[PDB]
Amino acid sequence: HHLPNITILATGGTIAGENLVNAVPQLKDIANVKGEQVVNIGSQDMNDNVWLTLAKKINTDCDKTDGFVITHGTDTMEETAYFLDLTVKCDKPVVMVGAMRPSTSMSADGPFNLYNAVVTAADKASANRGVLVVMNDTVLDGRDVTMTNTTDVATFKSVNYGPLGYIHNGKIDYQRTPARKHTSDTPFDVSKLNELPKVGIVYNYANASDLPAKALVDAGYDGIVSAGVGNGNLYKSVFDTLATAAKTGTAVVRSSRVPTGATTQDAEVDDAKYGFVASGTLNPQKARVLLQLALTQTKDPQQIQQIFNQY
Amino acid sequence: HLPNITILATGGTIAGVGVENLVNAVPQLKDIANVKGEQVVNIGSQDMNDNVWLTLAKKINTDCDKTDGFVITHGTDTMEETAYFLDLTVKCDKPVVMVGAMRPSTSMSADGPFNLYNAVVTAADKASANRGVLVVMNDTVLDGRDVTMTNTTDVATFKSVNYGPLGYIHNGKIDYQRTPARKHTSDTPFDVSKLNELPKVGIVYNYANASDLPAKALVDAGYDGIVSAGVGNGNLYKSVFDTLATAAKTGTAVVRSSRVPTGATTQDAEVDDAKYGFVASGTLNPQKARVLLQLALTQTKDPQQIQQIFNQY
Amino acid sequence: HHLPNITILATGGTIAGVENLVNAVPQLKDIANVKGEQVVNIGSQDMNDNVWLTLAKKINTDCDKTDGFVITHGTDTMEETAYFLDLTVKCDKPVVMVGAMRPSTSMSADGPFNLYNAVVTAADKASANRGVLVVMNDTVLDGRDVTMTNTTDVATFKSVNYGPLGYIHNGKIDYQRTPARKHTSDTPFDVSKLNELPKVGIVYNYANASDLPAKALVDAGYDGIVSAGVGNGNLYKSVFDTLATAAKTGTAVVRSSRVPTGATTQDAEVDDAKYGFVASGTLNPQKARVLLQLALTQTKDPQQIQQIFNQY
Amino acid sequence: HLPNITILATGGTIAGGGDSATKSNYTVGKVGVENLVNAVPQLKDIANVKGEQVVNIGSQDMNDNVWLTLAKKINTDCDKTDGFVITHGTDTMEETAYFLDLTVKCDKPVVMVGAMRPSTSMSADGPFNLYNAVVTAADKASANRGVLVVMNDTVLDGRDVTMTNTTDVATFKSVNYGPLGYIHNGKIDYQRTPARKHTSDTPFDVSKLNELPKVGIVYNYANASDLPAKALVDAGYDGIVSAGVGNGNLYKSVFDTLATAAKTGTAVVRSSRVPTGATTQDAEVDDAKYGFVASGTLNPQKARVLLQLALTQTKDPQQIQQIFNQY
Numbered sequence A: 001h002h003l004p005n006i007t008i009l010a011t012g013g014t015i016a017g018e019n020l021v022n023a024v025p026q027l028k029d030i031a032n033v034k035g036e037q038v039v040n041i042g043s044q045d046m047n048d049n050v051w052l053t054l055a056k057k058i059n060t061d062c063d064k065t066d067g068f069v070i071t072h073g074t075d076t077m078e079e080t081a082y083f084l085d086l087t088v089k090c091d092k093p094v095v096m097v098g099a100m101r102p103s104t105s106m107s108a109d110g111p112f113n114l115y116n117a118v119v120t121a122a123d124k125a126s127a128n129r130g131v132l133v134v135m136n137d138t139v140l141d142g143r144d145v146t147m148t149n150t151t152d153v154a155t156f157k158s159v160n161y162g163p164l165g166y167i168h169n170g171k172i173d174y175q176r177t178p179a180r181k182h183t184s185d186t187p188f189d190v191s192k193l194n195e196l197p198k199v200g201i202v203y204n205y206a207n208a209s210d211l212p213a214k215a216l217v218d219a220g221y222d223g224i225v226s227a228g229v230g231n232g233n234l235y236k237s238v239f240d241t242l243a244t245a246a247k248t249g250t251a252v253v254r255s256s257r258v259p260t261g262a263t264t265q266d267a268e269v270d271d272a273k274y275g276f277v278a279s280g281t282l283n284p285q286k287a288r289v290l291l292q293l294a295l296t297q298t299k300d301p302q303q304i305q306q307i308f309n310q311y
Numbered sequence B: 001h002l003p004n005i006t007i008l009a010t011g012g013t014i015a016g017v018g019v020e021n022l023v024n025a026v027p028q029l030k031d032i033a034n035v036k037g038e039q040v041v042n043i044g045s046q047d048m049n050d051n052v053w054l055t056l057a058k059k060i061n062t063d064c065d066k067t068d069g070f071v072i073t074h075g076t077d078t079m080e081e082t083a084y085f086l087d088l089t090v091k092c093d094k095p096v097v098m099v100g101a102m103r104p105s106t107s108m109s110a111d112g113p114f115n116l117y118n119a120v121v122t123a124a125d126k127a128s129a130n131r132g133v134l135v136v137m138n139d140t141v142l143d144g145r146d147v148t149m150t151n152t153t154d155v156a157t158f159k160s161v162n163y164g165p166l167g168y169i170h171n172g173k174i175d176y177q178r179t180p181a182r183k184h185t186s187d188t189p190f191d192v193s194k195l196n197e198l199p200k201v202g203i204v205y206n207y208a209n210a211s212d213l214p215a216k217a218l219v220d221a222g223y224d225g226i227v228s229a230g231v232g233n234g235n236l237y238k239s240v241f242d243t244l245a246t247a248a249k250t251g252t253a254v255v256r257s258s259r260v261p262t263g264a265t266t267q268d269a270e271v272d273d274a275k276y277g278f279v280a281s282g283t284l285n286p287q288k289a290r291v292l293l294q295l296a297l298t299q300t301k302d303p304q305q306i307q308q309i310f311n312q313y
Numbered sequence C: 001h002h003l004p005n006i007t008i009l010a011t012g013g014t015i016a017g018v019e020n021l022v023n024a025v026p027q028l029k030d031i032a033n034v035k036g037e038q039v040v041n042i043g044s045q046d047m048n049d050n051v052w053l054t055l056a057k058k059i060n061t062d063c064d065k066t067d068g069f070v071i072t073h074g075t076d077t078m079e080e081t082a083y084f085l086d087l088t089v090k091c092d093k094p095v096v097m098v099g100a101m102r103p104s105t106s107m108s109a110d111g112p113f114n115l116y117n118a119v120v121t122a123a124d125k126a127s128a129n130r131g132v133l134v135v136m137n138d139t140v141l142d143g144r145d146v147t148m149t150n151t152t153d154v155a156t157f158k159s160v161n162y163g164p165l166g167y168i169h170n171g172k173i174d175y176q177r178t179p180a181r182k183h184t185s186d187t188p189f190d191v192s193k194l195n196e197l198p199k200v201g202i203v204y205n206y207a208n209a210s211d212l213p214a215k216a217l218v219d220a221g222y223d224g225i226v227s228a229g230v231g232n233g234n235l236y237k238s239v240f241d242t243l244a245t246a247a248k249t250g251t252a253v254v255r256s257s258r259v260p261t262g263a264t265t266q267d268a269e270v271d272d273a274k275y276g277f278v279a280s281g282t283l284n285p286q287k288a289r290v291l292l293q294l295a296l297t298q299t300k301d302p303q304q305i306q307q308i309f310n311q312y
Numbered sequence D: 001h002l003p004n005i006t007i008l009a010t011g012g013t014i015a016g017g018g019d020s021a022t023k024s025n026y027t028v029g030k031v032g033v034e035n036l037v038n039a040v041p042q043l044k045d046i047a048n049v050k051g052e053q054v055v056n057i058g059s060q061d062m063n064d065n066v067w068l069t070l071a072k073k074i075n076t077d078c079d080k081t082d083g084f085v086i087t088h089g090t091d092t093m094e095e096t097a098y099f100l101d102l103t104v105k106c107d108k109p110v111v112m113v114g115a116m117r118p119s120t121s122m123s124a125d126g127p128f129n130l131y132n133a134v135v136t137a138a139d140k141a142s143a144n145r146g147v148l149v150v151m152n153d154t155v156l157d158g159r160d161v162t163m164t165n166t167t168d169v170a171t172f173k174s175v176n177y178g179p180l181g182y183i184h185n186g187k188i189d190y191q192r193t194p195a196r197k198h199t200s201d202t203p204f205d206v207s208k209l210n211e212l213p214k215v216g217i218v219y220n221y222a223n224a225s226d227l228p229a230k231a232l233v234d235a236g237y238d239g240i241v242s243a244g245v246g247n248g249n250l251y252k253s254v255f256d257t258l259a260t261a262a263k264t265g266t267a268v269v270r271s272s273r274v275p276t277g278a279t280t281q282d283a284e285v286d287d288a289k290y291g292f293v294a295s296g297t298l299n300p301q302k303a304r305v306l307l308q309l310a311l312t313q314t315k316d317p318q319q320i321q322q323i324f325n326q327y
């Protein structure tokens, strides 16, 4: 039927626990689909190498297909999506999808999710909107998308800025696109990288130990993202250790444990004074993604901050 | 006749200044209560700690028959943790209401004044008793267990994001339609009156390619318990998993919670808690699971007994 | 095996689009001894008073013959029927409503698992004395506060003001809330001998609203009118005037709100006592209609109706 | 150096007042524009403000005349100023905003603002709301984003913005597609812009109009009476918008009346009483068969705005559906 060619890159996850494609015979109505297995892991075990493989795969295979769907565990899909959002140079739709219920359960969500991810990958209007996550009839941008609930099939939301489009009857009404620079408009280029800078996450809370921050420091980590309290604030011991790290060759990004809203400049922390960077709307795991990539370009906290204001 | 209400002041943006100052800026408190202020500490709640926790519980318990209710003025950033600590440790049967402010007192449309007003309204309402320790923010009565910050700056940030609020405040009156089922205050076995420290519990975060070095550092330091902020339904990165499995075998209490802001970390999912001796946190977020785990550790070190605690409180 | 006896009363809805509903979910036999009866077979957009009277009477009459009930229903008005049953069911055992947002033949159709979970809830001894319930997307919701939030989302049903009662995981429920308002055997509404309910209609407010709907309901002698008001139950001027007239010439007038969350309060911009109006509080216009209809079976007096709206 | 900002005042609770800081009771549109401006002396740090009283009412009484007046004044005064703020009641702000979104041709920012607490209330929300509205109207980045609503530190597009709560200061949300930007320390980080066509990309021109087509709204629910629909039909309404159940469905009696109406000279639009999500084509109602139009994400009161303006161009239900799909 003059249909597009869509490539599925499989990484594992609950959606996949070749016969994945076969369980959605209706895919034949909308695309000529071909699958490849890149890895087969639970996304709780997602890592830098898988990321690099995947960006490299998409970038080199871009001209052989019309669109990509990546099948992926839900738990870290939001990280993978932002990492691809920043490192993919291919102009064609790249769509991640997962399932909250196993494939063998009652009212399993994966089949229709897969169908809708292919719809989205096949839609010429999906191009130039960056890397996308399609979950529960909704097209979500790679940067803002996050999990909101541990088990709900509707868990994926773009909690700060909203979704891009809703899918009804195999058609999308797009009403938004992300303003922040993505894909071809980023300076990030991992084509020749076999590793990424080391970036770890420390949590803040009443009476918080400095021992985690200390441990990352002791190991020579290139960057530390703080999951701060409220508007990216730090427990006094963690503050002291990160203040030292920032002046001793470690990039420090203030983010927040709070699920929505920006960690802003000009609030209780003098970031200029400490050599810190404020993560804006990027949650701790998102901020790690961008901090890693920023570190491949620069160690300068003021250039890092600018990166955090543009990507 | 108006109620005697005691404000225990701890600092926070609501104060940023002594407690006398706070009370005198909201003269309308004179129409609903006889307010007395005591300064307990004066800190940003980012610097909240176990010694202040223990001070507050002890104070409230000791001065319970001196007053008709308590309001605790507090920073927002960690209010949700103090409220839960107090919810499990206070034995006083009179209302205990925590408040703060998302905007500085000097700010245009500062939220602090009406927030404090409504906190006193709540503390003064007889209907407020026996509902546990409460947080009052943005015209809403929230329970200390479920209440959490939802946004970094929004005045409406405080929400009980899994089971909802208790009541809404309009024209100085509350319409309560909910009370928390989990055991609280005088129905808990937790008693901190003779404690001068709490057991040591830290929180580690999970994410892609997560370092095991945070968890190992806590283990090396002999931490009594570790709370994991897992991915999805409390899952762990493979390295972190290995580290905590080993720790649990030698007697560290390990609690699986989630970085995901709503919903339960369940038993009977991808992790065989029984096999590993882990505890599942239910709807308790990592900071809240810490509060409960520290208290559970004052009663037992047995993970099945800690799990029953996590199922009842 | 020693399983509870659970009755499915079928009313139609996309979940059906009884005997073959039950057969579609074999896993039911693991949790309940299930039997179905067809009550009606309609899309819930055509839900009506006569079906509500039939359901209430049936549950009340058949209460001793079963351990609990699941009511399969369309999604569009399930929130209405749920609150009607909440106020009229005298049976003490669980009554759980369930529907499906996706057609039964669609990919990832939600009906099978929803129904599984509705039987789980009906079977749970802990579900008793919580009022009539709606079970949708793994969540147990109370009949008073439950409403649609989205036109098509499988997660649409939420208790938007006070939250859910429990969450369902692996066939078990962790309940942490129960509705304070009075329900079921604690209400005085008794529909057992009623062949009809009082006429209550709903008018919508907006900029430049016409009084012509309100005037039509008054002209026809309606027993009450619910206003879907703007903001905190406010009324377009011409609508205000017509409802004021109606309030003093027999018609009970409830101010509710078009706005999806929050109470319509007393003591804002409208002096309800002066006009003889009743504030709906957290009841949305379709829910306020249900309560107003039932109030009007007990009293026409606006203070007593306000008291009912403060208690149920 | 500072921009020129015009405040066109309409009333609302933002200019309302009560008998005490602490009682909820208040009255709307007493206080004049000048009193609001003088309560925010910080305005002086960010704009040269000029205020004009257009009307002084509760937005509950907003109407087609006030809309027409506002649109004509903004289009007429566009070169006199760097941007406009319209102070307005909250209850129908979402309607005026979308009306203006479709009819204003001026290509400078037009920002609407209210308050959920009156000026006399403890922790009154108006003054900071006003300040942030002016910051929004002053920001060169706010241009070419349509008409805006600024409430609780958030910039919202006129089309999607709506009230979600009867009393919460945080009530205004863009419930389907989200906000455009958040305001912190007098600055906006814009991340979105509405895709649907607005202002100078719409064919709607009300400059010569003194009245708009008559369009009413009927609610759906169990046992719905057909009497409200019939009343609108007997008066010769130009259009009727149904606030449907679920995905724009209609109670059988209402369906029967509106079926007649669509083929007997009345435009009918299916919307939904459900607060978020689209009323779609290709669900349970064959719109083509019945001559109906589906509202998409437009709620009943927003769908009335677009239908009224659509009726100024066309009576053809196919053309009206094309309009609901573009604007």
Ligand SMILES: N[C@@H](CC(=O)O)C(=O)O
Binding pocket: A012, A013, A014, A015, A041, A042, A043, A044, A072, A073, A074, A075, A076, A098, A099, A100, A101, B232, B235, B270
């Ligand atoms: N642990 C699974 C969860 C899921 O896919 O639902 C994953 O991330 O791989």
Ligand SMILES: N[C@@H](CC(=O)O)C(=O)O
Binding pocket: A230, A233, A268, B011, B012, B013, B014, B043, B044, B045, B046, B074, B075, B076, B077, B078, B100, B101, B102, B103
């Ligand atoms: N950092 C402050 C924030 C506030 O109170 O708004 C605190 O938590 O103490």
Ligand SMILES: N[C@@H](CC(=O)O)C(=O)O
Binding pocket: C012, C013, C014, C015, C042, C043, C044, C045, C073, C074, C075, C076, C077, C099, C100, C101, C102, D246, D249, D284
């Ligand atoms: N119109 C159907 C919708 C559904 O059940 O999903 C009904 O309410 O009966």
Ligand SMILES: N[C@@H](CC(=O)O)C(=O)O
Binding pocket: C231, C234, C269, D011, D012, D013, D014, D028, D057, D058, D059, D060, D088, D089, D090, D091, D092, D114, D115, D116, D117
């Ligand atoms: N009824 C008032 C409500 C408010 O503005 O808060 C108005 O819309 O004018």
